[PDB]
Amino acid sequence: ITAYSQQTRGLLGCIITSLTGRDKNQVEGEVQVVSTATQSFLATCVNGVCWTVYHGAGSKTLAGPKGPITQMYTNVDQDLVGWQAPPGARSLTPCTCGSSDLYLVTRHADVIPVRRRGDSRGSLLSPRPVSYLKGSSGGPLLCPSGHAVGIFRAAVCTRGVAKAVDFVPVESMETTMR
Amino acid sequence: ITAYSQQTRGLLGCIITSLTGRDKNQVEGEVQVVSTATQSFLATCVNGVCWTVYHGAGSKTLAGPKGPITQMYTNVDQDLVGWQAPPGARSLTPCTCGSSDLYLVTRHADVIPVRRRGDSRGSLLSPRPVSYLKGSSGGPLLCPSGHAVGIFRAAVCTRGVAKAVDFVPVESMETTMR
């Protein structure tokens, strides 16, 4: 599995687009890299809905082709918030098929192996500093097939380095949709 | 208790106000949400002084009406930092009541009940995931009456779950002010 980051905006673009709330550009790719005034993070489409983490987005709207999209889903207790996917988005399809071999994709585009160690638990093979996963909250955890198993919430770190990851599992996103 | 968020600047103003050091805006509320170039957290006014956490502010000045304000305090070992409260700045009054029934008001205006497990901790009755708390350190911890009993320092996590939190006691801020 591989990935390549692509920038589509800069300061003026975010500042104006965030004011008007209307983004004329077009969505493309499975995981978009979003940003607010204070923080930047990721958002991943799974089942035609832009899912992201509550801590980063809060209850803000997404800038869209016809104006600001209101959050369709909001599961605060699981730090989840999802917007109805805008046009051009190549949505991922769920998975969670017993596999314990996952791949975390970060916001600079690096696909790192995470061995599932639970439902929302997953140890890393290659430890990295907590500094290496900043801005990747809301990223997707991909099994080998290329199907989404969950949304990354934050690194499980021990005084210095990151050891494991905590994720909102795809299944939970499915139940929140109902 | 209840509370609500209110954005007062976007990226372009944080930027400009970060370099000129002068904040030409009316301060209101009691807990403000502040930012630096690589971070955003909270800061609250107890006893006429804007307290925040050291791991956020560090030793930087706070942009103010006549120019940047210099730190009045700096307990690096306690992770506490403070600035004299600029014009107005509503200030929460110290505790009194010793109620184990604490209240953590998160950076997104979310209020979550906390049970004081002692001098400097407070368990969460409803154990949220650790990431929910991101960007909320520095926030206040009240008791049913609306009194400040601490400053959110860090969530005491376990397997990515924020079972409880760590706060600087208001008594320790007071000791400092002595």
């Binding site: 905006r9 965030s18 493309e28 790719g29 978009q32 890299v33 979003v34 940003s35 997404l62 | -």
Partner: peptide, 13 residues
């Protein structure tokens, strides 16, 4: 209020 804003994308392959 200010809106979140897609700033780029990560294209899987």
């Amino acid at each position: 209020k200010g809106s979140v804003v897609i700033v780029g994308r990560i294209i899987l392959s």
